[PDB]
Specification:
This is part of a larger assembly, with five copies of chain A (348 residues). Chain A is α+β, with helices and mostly antiparallel strands and 348 residues long. The first copy, chain A, is 20% helix and 28% strand. Chain A has three domains: 1-65, no CATH class; 66-191, no CATH class; 192-348, no CATH class. The radius of gyration of chain A is 23 Å and the shape is globular. Chains in contact: A-B, A-C, A-E, B-C, B-D, B-E, C-D, D-E. The complex binds 4-amino-N-(2-hydroxyethyl)-N-methylbenzene-1-sulfonamide (3 copies). One 4-amino-N-(2-hydroxyethyl)-N-methylbenzene-1-sulfonamide sits between chains C (80-81, 98-99, 109, 117, 120-121) and A (99, 109, 117, 120). Chains A, B, C, D, E: Residues 3-63 form the Nsp15 N-terminal oligomerization domain.
Chain lengths: 348, 348, 348, 348, 348
C-alpha cells in the first residue's frame, strides 16, 4: 500500500523507507517535498533528477543503505537496472538506473527480475539478499556481487572500497570488497585482469603505499631519483607544468593533491558523474596556468608506475589500452628518442 | 488513511473522492497531477489555485457534489470556512475557502467545527448532513442551510438556484432552494429582506417573466411605452448608449443579452470571481464604444423596475442602498428636473 | 544532424518536421518553445506532456501527418511503440507511446525495430512505408496496418475512420480504412470479429443510418414502437432518465446528442484519453439530475440494438462480453420478468 | 511612484493602469498575479510573455486602450518601439515591442523618445497625444499616426480598421482610420500606394462588397460566369480543390469562409502572430484533403480580382510583387497556354 | 504604503526593511527576486518557503534583526505567531510562523495582537519594544521575553544564547539572556525547572566547563575514571561504538565533536529544522559504521552526567522524562545488573 504520505512518514520516522505503516501531511511545490511539523513546512527532499518530484522522492527513500558498488563500476560492467533495490547516484543526486524492478509503481518495468521484459537488460543482483544468487543463475544478462564464494562460479575480486550512503570507504565494521560475476546471453563471462581507481578526494587525500608517502613528502627531484623514474615524464604527467598559459600534464589525482597543499586551484567538473576517468576545466590560482579538458585518474602511484614502465617507448604516438575498473581506458603515449614526453587518459 | 494515490484512485474510479480503498500510480509535474494508464500519463488535474498541487487536488476531489449555495451568497453572508466539506469555486477553479474543517490534513485548522480555533470564524453548516443543524446551534459564528424548518429558528428563504458541480440551476430532480440561517457571536441574526440576482449567462440568457420576454422581443420605444418607463432612463441604463467613445449605461445583464443577439462585444472580466455585481471592461465590436469599468447586475427586469420606481427623483445625486443576495448594494442615482439621468451599481 | 533550432526551422517553414536544413533562433522558457520573428518571441509549442519541453517539441514536430489509427484502436491491440514514426495523441496533447524507434535521440530505445531491445514490445508498423511489412514479418511482436493485401497474411478490416492531424474522419481524398494484422511471440494472431465505435462528437453528431435518423427525429414512444424495442429499456439506457437526483442510464452517445439539442449538460471527462468506453461525471443543467460515473459508448444505434436483442433476458444480472474496437467490453445486463431493466458498459 | 501593488490597485479599480493612487495585496506564483479579495486569491493576470511576470503585468496594465494600428501594420512599417505607450499584441498575449520609452523602469531604454539611445530605432508616435507630432519631427526614425493633417507632411491614408482592446473594428463612435507618416535617417519617406487586408475572422466573416455577397451566395460556376473569371483559376485558388490528398489552392479568406459554412476544417496556426499573409496547416474534415503550409490572405475579393486581372499570363512561372499593408507581398503566378494555373502568396 | 519595489529599495539601501521611502526596479522569475543595477539583474532573494515569492521576500526583509529566542525555544513554549515582528527561521530559510500581526498585508491576520482573531493563539511579545509587556498582560495566550524585571510577574531565566541574524551566540555587546513569561487562557503560567541545550556546531565546538575540556583532551578511559562514570555506558552513549555495522550510541554533540577531530563522518539532517533533539542518518567514513536515526542532543556534559546519575538503574527498560528547553524530552533508559546499557533521546 504505497503512498507519498507513507514514504514521507518513513523518511521522517526511520531516516529512509523502511516498510513502516503511517502517514504524515505532505505538500509538493515545484520540485520540493515538504511535510508539516507543528504547523510549519519542513523540506524533506529537493528533486535534482529528470523524474517527477514524487517519483524521485520515493526512489531516494527506497535507496540501498548498505555498502554498494560505486556507480562507475556498475556502469563499466554494463548494468542497466537493479533487482529489487535502488542504487542512488550521489554524484548526480539521481537514481543510477532509469527503471526499477519491484521498487516503485511509476518506474517498475517488472515486479521480479525473471519477467521477459528484463531478458535483454543486464540486471544487478546482490548476493547478500536471499534468493538473488539464484535469480542471477536464471537471468540471461546480469552482474552479481557477493561477500563469499558461489559454488561453480569462479570470482573476480572487486575494489577494496564501496559507497555507503554516498561515502566511498574501505569497510572496517562492514564488508566493502565484493566478488563480481557477470553473464551475457546466458553465458557466465570471464571478467578481465583489472586495475582499480582509488576513489580519493583532493581535499582529504591519503597515501596508500610507501611510494605515495614518498611522493607527497619528498621534493620532485628526490622522488624521481629514488624510484628510477628518469625519462618517464613524471615532472609533466604527475607533478604538472604551470610555466605556460596551457597547464601541462597533471593527470593523476596524487599530483593534484600535492599541488593543492601549496597552491589552490579551480576544478570545473563540467560532466558531473561517477567515472573511472574524470575531466576538469582547471585554472591554477597562483600562476594562471589553465586547461579546458584535463583528464584525471586516481590510480595508486605504484599502479601508474607499473603501467608506464610496461610500455614500448620507441614510437612517436600510440594508443595504450589499460583495463581499469573492468573497462578499457585508452591512454595516449607520446615518446621521443626512447623517453616519454606525455601519457594521458585519451580524450575521445 | 489519506494519500495522494488513494485520492487519485477515487478520482479515476468514482469521478471524485468517495472514501474507497485503493491506489493508482501518480506523477506530479509542476502543477499537474497525472496517472499511468496502459503505460501513458493521463492528466487528472491542473492546479489553478495558490495551494500546493497535491493539496489542491485533494480539496477538488473532496468538493461538495450536491447542490450548494453560490459562492457570492456565502461571501455576502460572511462565510470563512465550511464544516466537513469543500465548497469548490468553479469561477476561480479554487476552493471557496482557504482552510478546512475535517477534510484534508494540510488545510485543516480543526477536525470538528466545535474546536475553539473555529469560534471566531463564520462556519458554513449544511442541514442536509446529520448533526450539522446541532453544530450550528453550538457554534459561535455560522451560516446554516436546510431543506425544511428547524424548530424555533426563524428562516430566510434563499435563491431559487444553487450550484451543482459548477452548473447554476433551479432544481427539478434536486432541491436548490434553501432556508438560510446566520449567527454572530452566539446570537442568531435576522437576515434582511432581499432581492436575488438571477445568475444567468450572456450566451444562454432566458427571460423569466413576461416583462423580460417583452424586453427581448419588443423595440426599445414600445417597451418603454408599454411599461410606463418614460423618464426612467432605460434607453441609457438598460439598453445602453453606443454613440460616444465612452459606452453609456448598460448595467443590467438583460440589456447586454439583447445587444449580444445583434452585435457581439468583448467583456473583459478583470476580477474573475463570483459576485452580486460584476465589473467588465467592455468594447463594442460594431461601434468601438467602450468602458473600462462597466458594472453589471443580473436582476429580474421586474425587480429592477420596482427598485428604480421606488426612488425619490428630486435630488441631483444620491446613494441608493438596495439589499441584493443578502448584501447592501450601493447604487448611484442621478436625476434632473424630476427624471432619471442614470442609475448604476456605484463603483466602490 | 538533429537540433532544436533545426526542428524549429522545419516547424516555421514546413508546418512540421520535413527533414529540411536550416536553423531559427529559439528560446525555451519553462514549458514553452518560442522563436524570434522581427525581434519578438512567437510561441511555437506548449509542452502538455511529462517529457522535457525540447524532447516533446521534437516528437510533436515529427508526428505522423498521414491518416493513422485512432489511439484507442492501437491501445486495444496492445501497441507499445511505433516503428520510425510518432503517433501523436491529440486527446492528451502527448505522444501516444513513451519511447521511439529511429525518431529522436532522447526517446529512442533503438534506431531500427529489429534490435533485440524491441523484441518484447508490440511494435506498430505502417505498410504504407517501404520495408515496414517485411519488418513486421521479422518482428517478434507487432501490429501492422496496410492499404491492401499482404501475400499469405489473413487480414482484419479495421474501422472506416482514421485520425488525420487530430481530425477523426472517413476519407474521401485519402484512405482511412486499413487492414489490420497482429503478431504475439512470433506468431500471427487471428484478430477477433468486432464491432467498431463511431468516434462522433456530441456537438457535431451526425446520424449514419435510417434508425439513427429516426431516433433523432421521432419522439421516444414512436421510435420504440417502430423498431419493436418494447421491453428493451431504451427509455432508461439510451434516452436517459432525469427525474431522480441520480441520472438514469444515458450510455449511448446518440442519446446524449438527442438530449443536447434540447437541454445542455456538463460532461466532466475526468480521465481525458482516447478509449472505446468513455466515463463522464454528468450534470444535467435543466433538471439537476447527475451521475459521478456515466459510461458512454458511441456505437451505431443498429449495432447496439443488435447486441441488446441477442441477449438471453431470463437472468437477474450477468456480464455480457462484446468485442468492440478489437477489445472485450464487459456490459452489465439486468433483467426482470423477461424484460431489460438496464444494460451498461460495466464499470471496472 | 510605480509599484506592483499600485499597478494591481489600478487594474482592480479602473480595469487598467490609470495613474490612480493606492495599493492592493498581491501574490505572485509562478507566472500568475493574484490579489486578495475577502481572504481569497483572485487571478488578475497570467503571463504568456517571455518577460518576468511582474514586468509583463505592468506593461499589460499600461496597454493602449484607444484604437491603435494592428500589429501587422506596425511591423510592416518597421516599428521597433512605441513612444510613451504600450501596444499590446492580443494575438501573442504579449507586448508588441520588447522595450519601452517612459512606461516601465524594467523595460525602459529612455524616458523620452529624444534620447540618443532611440535615434537608431523606428519609434511609433501617436498624433492624438500632445507633443507627439513634434517628437516625430525631431526623431531620426519613426512612424506617426494622426486623425487629421499635419502641416507640410504628405499623408498616407491607412486602413479603415484599427484594434481597440484586441477587437479589430471600423469605428463608428471612435476614429480608426489614420493618416500614416514614416521617417528613415531624418528623412520623411513617401509610403507606397498599397492595398489593405480586411482583418476578418473565419467564424464571423461578413462580405464588404456586392462581389463578395455574390461569391458567398452564388454557386461556383455562375459566380465565375457573372464576373468574367474564366481562365483565372478561381476554382483552385479561391474555392479550393479537395479531391486529392494535398488540398489545392484555398488562399483567400473568403474562400475558406464559404467552405466553413458547409464543412468544418482544422487550421493549425503554427506561427501565431499578426501578419498580412497567414500560414496554416489545414486538414479538411469532410474529405481528409490537407496541406502543411497553406498561405491565406484576407483581401477584399474585388482587390484580389483586380490584382490577378492585371497580370501578364504568358509566362510559365514568375514572381508578382503587390504592395499590401505597406509591405511587398511576393506571389507566385503559374500560367499555361495564356490561362492561370495557380496564384498564391509565395512561401518564403 | 507597502510595495515590492519599496521593500527592494530598503533591502538594497539598508540591508533589510527599515521603513525608508523609495523604489528600485524589480523582476520576479520563478522563485527569485532580482533588481536592476547598471542595466543588469542582481539577485536579492531566493524563495525557499512555501509562501509566494514576493510575500516571502517581504517577510524576510521585515525579519527581526535583534537577538531573538531560538525557534526551538519558541516552538517548545507553544508560540503560534509573533506580535508586530517576523521571527525568521534560518535553519528552514522561512518565517518561523505562518501568519503575522501588523507586518505584511498578505500574511496579516490582524494589525494589533488585541484583535479577537488572535485570542486562541499564543502570541510572542518582546518586552524590548514599547507597549509589548502591556499587550502580554491583556492577551489571553502569550509568551513574553524581557531583559529585566516585570512587576508582579515572577520570571523564568532563559538560555544564555540567542539568535542574531541566524548566528546563535552568547552576547557580549548585546543582551541574549531573557526572562521568559507565559499565559494560557488568561492565567500566568509557572514555567518549569529546565535544562538548556547549548546550540553548538560540530565544526566549531567549544567546551563550556572543565568536564567538557577533560572529555575533549583526555583519553576515554582516563575521563571515565576521573569523573567516576564506571557503569554509566559513556563508552557507548557519548563516545560511540563503531565496531559493528550499526553505529552504537553517539547521542551527545560533544562525543560527535571529539570523533570529528579524528575521523570525518556524514550527518544527513533528514528533518532540517530547529529542535531540542536532532535526528541524523550518520555514516562513519573511517569504519563504515552507520545508523538511520541517530538522535543527538547538545547538553553541557555536566548536565548529561547529572541526568544519567539521577536515575534508578534497577529496571530493564523505562522512559525517563527530562525538561529541556521548556519541553518534556523522553529518553529511553536500558539497564542490566544495576549498570546502564544505553540512554538515548527516545525515537517516538
Ligand atoms: C487558524 N488561523 C486563525 C483562525 O483563528 S489561520 O490558520 O491563520 C486561518 C484559518 C482560516 C481562515 N479563514 C483564516 C486564517
Ligand atoms: C528499453 N526499456 C525496456 C524495453 O525492453 S525501457 O526504456 O525501460 C521502455 C521502453 C519502451 C516502453 N514502452 C517501456 C519501457
Ligand atoms: C538599448 N539597446 C540597443 C538600442 O540601441 S537594447 O536594450 O539592447 C534594445 C532595445 C530595443 C530594441 N527594440 C532592441 C534592442
Amino acid at each position: 500500500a504505497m503512498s507519498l504520505e507513507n514514504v514521507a512518514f518513513n523518511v521522517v520516522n526511520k531516516g529512509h523507507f523502511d516498510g513502516q505503516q503511517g502517514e504524515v501531511p505532505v505538500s509538493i511545490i515545484n520540485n520540493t517535498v515538504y511535510t508539516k511539523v507543528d504547523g510549519v513546512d519542513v523540506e524533506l527532499f529537493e528533486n535534482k533528477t529528470t523524474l517527477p518530484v514524487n517519483v524521485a522522492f520515493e526512489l531516494w527513500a527506497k535507496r540501498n543503505i548498505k555498502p554498494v558498488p560505486e556507480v562507475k563500476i556498475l556502469n563499466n560492467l554494463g548494468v542497466d537496472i537493479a533487482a529489487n533495490t535502488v542504487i542512488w547516484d550521489y554524484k548526480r543526486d539521481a537514481p543510477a538506473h532509469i527503471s526499477t524492478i519491484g521498487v516503485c509503481s511509476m518506474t517498475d518495468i517488472a515486479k521480479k527480475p525473471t519477467e521477459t521484459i528484463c531478458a535483454p537488460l543486464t540486471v544487478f543482483f546482490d548476493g547478500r539478499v536471499d534468493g538473488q544468487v539464484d535469480l542471477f543463475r536464471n537471468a540471461r544478462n546480469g552482474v552479481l556481487i557477493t561477500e563469499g564464494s558461489v559454488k561453480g562460479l569462479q570470482p573476480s575480486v572487486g575494489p577494496k572500497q564501496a559507497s555507503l550512503n554516498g561515502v566511498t570507504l574501505i569497510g572496517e565494521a562492514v564488508k566493502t570488497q565484493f566478488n563480481y560475476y557477470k553473464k551475457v546471453d546466458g553465458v557466465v563471462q570471464q571478467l578481465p585482469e583489472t586495475y582499480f581507481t582509488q576513489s580519493r578526494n583532493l581535499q582529504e587525500f591519503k597515501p596508500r603505499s610507501q611510494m605515495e608517502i614518498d611522493f607527497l613528502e619528498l621534493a620532485m627531484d628526490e622522488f624521481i631519483e629514488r624510484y628510477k623514474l628518469e625519462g618517464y615524464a613524471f615532472e609533466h604527467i604527475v607533478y604538472g607544468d604551470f610555466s605556460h598559459s596551457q597547464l601541462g600534464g597533471l593527470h593523476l589525482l596524487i599530483g593534484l593533491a600535492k599541488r593543492f597543499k601549496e597552491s589552490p586551484f579551480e576544478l570545473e567538473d563540467f560532466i558531473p558523474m561517477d567515472s573511472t576517468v574524470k575531466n576538469y576545466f582547471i585554472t591554477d590560482a597562483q600562476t594562471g596556468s589553465s586547461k579546458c579538458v584535463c583528464s584525471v585518474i586516481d590510480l595508486l602511484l605504484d599502479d601508474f608506475v607499473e603501467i608506464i614502465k610496461s610500455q614500448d617507448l620507441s614510437v612517436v604516438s600510440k594508443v595504450v589500452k589499460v583495463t581499469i575498473d573492468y573497462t578499457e581506458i585508452s591512454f595516449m603515449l607520446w615518446c621521443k628518442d626512447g623517453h616519454v614526453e606525455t601519457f594521458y587518459p585519451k580524450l575521445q
